[PDB]
Amino acid sequence: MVLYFIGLGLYDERDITVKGLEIAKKCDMVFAEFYTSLMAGTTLGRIQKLIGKEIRVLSREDVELNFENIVLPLAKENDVAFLTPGDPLVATTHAELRIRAKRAGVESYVIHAPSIYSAVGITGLHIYKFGKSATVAYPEGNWFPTSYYDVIKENAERGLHTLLFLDIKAEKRMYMTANEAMELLLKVEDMKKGGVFTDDTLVVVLARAGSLNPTIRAGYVKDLIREDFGDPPHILIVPGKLHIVEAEYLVEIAGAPREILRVNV
Amino acid sequence: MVLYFIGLGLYDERDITVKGLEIAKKCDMVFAEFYTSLMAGTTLGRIQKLIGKEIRVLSREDVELNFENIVLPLAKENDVAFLTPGDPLVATTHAELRIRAKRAGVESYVIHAPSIYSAVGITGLHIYKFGKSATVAYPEGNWFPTSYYDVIKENAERGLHTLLFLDIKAEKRMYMTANEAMELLLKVEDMKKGGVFTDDTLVVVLARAGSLNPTIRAGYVKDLIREDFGDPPHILIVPGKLHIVEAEYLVEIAGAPREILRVNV
Numbered sequence: 001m002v003l004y005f006i007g008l009g010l011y012d013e014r015d016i017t018v019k020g021l022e023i024a025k026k027c028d029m030v031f032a033e034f035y036t037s038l039m040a041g042t043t044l045g046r047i048q049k050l051i052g053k054e055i056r057v058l059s060r061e062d063v064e065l066n067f068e069n070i071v072l073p074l075a076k077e078n079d080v081a082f083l084t085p086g087d088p089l090v091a092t093t094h095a096e097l098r099i100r101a102k103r104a105g106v107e108s109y110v111i112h113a114p115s116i117y118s119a120v121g122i123t124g125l126h127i128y129k130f131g132k133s134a135t136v137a138y139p140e141g142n143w144f145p146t147s148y149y150d151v152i153k154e155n156a157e158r159g160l161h162t163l164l165f166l167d168i169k170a171e172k173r174m175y176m177t178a179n180e181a182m183e184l185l186l187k188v189e190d191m192k193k194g195g196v197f198t199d200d201t202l203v204v205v206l207a208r209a210g211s212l213n214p215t216i217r218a219g220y221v222k223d224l225i226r227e228d229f230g231d232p233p234h235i236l237i238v239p240g241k242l243h244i245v246e247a248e249y250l251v252e253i254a255g256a257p258r259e260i261l262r263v264n265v
Numbered sequence: 266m267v268l269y270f271i272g273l274g275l276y277d278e279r280d281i282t283v284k285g286l287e288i289a290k291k292c293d294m295v296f297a298e299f300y301t302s303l304m305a306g307t308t309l310g311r312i313q314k315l316i317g318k319e320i321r322v323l324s325r326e327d328v329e330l331n332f333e334n335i336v337l338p339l340a341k342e343n344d345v346a347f348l349t350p351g352d353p354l355v356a357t358t359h360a361e362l363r364i365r366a367k368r369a370g371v372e373s374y375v376i377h378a379p380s381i382y383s384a385v386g387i388t389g390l391h392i393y394k395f396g397k398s399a400t401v402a403y404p405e406g407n408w409f410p411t412s413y414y415d416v417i418k419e420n421a422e423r424g425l426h427t428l429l430f431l432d433i434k435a436e437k438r439m440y441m442t443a444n445e446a447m448e449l450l451l452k453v454e455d456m457k458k459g460g461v462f463t464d465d466t467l468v469v470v471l472a473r474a475g476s477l478n479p480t481i482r483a484g485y486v487k488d489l490i491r492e493d494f495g496d497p498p499h500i501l502i503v504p505g506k507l508h509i510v511e512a513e514y515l516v517e518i519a520g521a522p523r524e525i526l527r528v529n530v
């Protein structure tokens with residue numbers, strides 16, 4: 001009689017919470033989407049094995065246009081689960097699906113899972129110091145998205161770090177790298193010339209958070225822009241003014257140049 | 266030779282991820298800290314029973330002053346687990362513990378878990394619009410801290426939401442309520458009179474996130490300040506201008522008054 005939004009986590013099938021697993025195991029039917037993010041350390045097969053259920057994967061069109069036609073109808077007579085990577089309601093539009101559920105007379109419940117949005121804490125940057133977040137979208141045709149640039153500018157002026165979700169085209173199997181995001185930002189810099197992102201700008205890259213050996217690197221764009229950070233997914237962070245302990249972590253754990261230890265107060 | 270930082274999640278013993286539980290089980294010794302926060306929906310007894318290991322609780326001083334004397338020594342000839350509520354490294358002091366592990370020649374790995382920082386997405390508010398975060402601390406003696414007030418101002422000034430962690434006396438198990446938090450904020454507004462928090466300010470309250478029955482309420486201070494939001498923990502959010510989709514969710518899912526569709530959008 002109910003619908004469950006259950007997050008699967010950051011990297012592999014085991015990043016689901018015990019709560020999430022126990023509930024999914026007792027659902028009559030399980031649905032899922034794998035276009036909002038990329039779980040690089042697992043396969044649908046492994047998720048199905050762990051949950052002991054067959055999972056019907058939905059596309060963005062299935063969800064965005066027919067969620068109330070494919071999923072909700074079954075709720076009235078079943079306990080249904082809808083699985084998604086990371087946390088189901090973070091940097092997605094899935095929250096709106098709950099409204100669709102309500103209007104359809106279906107109760108819904110949300111089971112959280114580790115999200116890239118808080119996992120950035122592994123970079124050593126104070127979570128509270130993060131300001132507005134943004135997404136670096138692939139330019140398409142004559143349309144070249146550039147709003148994320150201004151977001152970085154506003155946060156920096158306030159001494160806040162900027163979290164940059166990188167773009168994804170799940171059906172084309174394209175996952176934007178930190179390198180590609182940097183290239184786009186350098187280009188937007190030439191455009192606006194606001195001195196927001198250049199060769200000397202310090203950045204932090206977090207790749208495959210959730211795995212046991214994520215790639216955590218910090219340095220100047222000029223040096224990291226052509227560095228190999230491994231397989232996707234990637235996230236890119238542009239730090240604001242650094243606290244001393246933040247810098248120490250970047251140097252000790254993320255291999256940043258020792259010179260950032262010298263914070264300019 | 267290894268140390269694992271494992272998040273316990275949001276509310277109860279099932280909020281740990283399958284990865285964290287399976288790893289905690291293969292660990293020779295397991296420590297835990299409950300001073301950055303508490304797991305309001307469970308007990309040490311239940312967590313121990315789920316993991317099947319005796320758990321040694323460490324106080325703030327144990328960790329901040331003797332982490333390398335209590336935890337790291339065992340981490341040399343054993344696999345050690347250090348459990349924390351939420352997602353590891355979200356608490357600002359945790360990050361350096363990894364530097365200590367390095368200094369001691371001990372490998373460390375982080376096992377993520379749901380954090381309130383990402384769980385607020387269940388309020389229906391877009392995660393990207395959250396700005397800097399703050400903690401509302403209890404005034405004591407001749408000390409009246411109000412930086413959290415300024416944080417709201419700067420965020421809402423740029424149309425961003427403000428996540429407010431409420432004070433907590435971990436050791437004494439005392440939780441600051443949203444009600445008290447609103448009272449404090451009304452007192453500060455009467456102090457700085459910068460028009461940031463009044464009876465007409467729209468706020469959002471999230472209680473017991475992670476539970477299947479969290480309390481999600483939205484409304485104007487005058488109507489919520491004396492409302493009973495249930496048992497702790499409470500989280501207070503002061504939203505900035507709302508996207509129609511955010512407002513509709515607050516009305517449909519959190520019982521917000523229709524007035525917000527015209528006043529806060």
Ligand SMILES: Nc1ncnc2c1ncn2[C@@H]1O[C@H](CSCC[C@H](N)C(=O)O)[C@@H](O)[C@H]1O
Nearest residue numbers: 037086087090115116166208209233234235
């Ligand atoms: N494990 C991971 N490591 C690095 N970046 C990740 C990641 N998981 C997601 N992302 C980043 O976030 C984007 C997906 S946005 C959706 C996020 C998801 N709900 C969550 O809670 O994590 C990706 O394109 C990528 O840039």
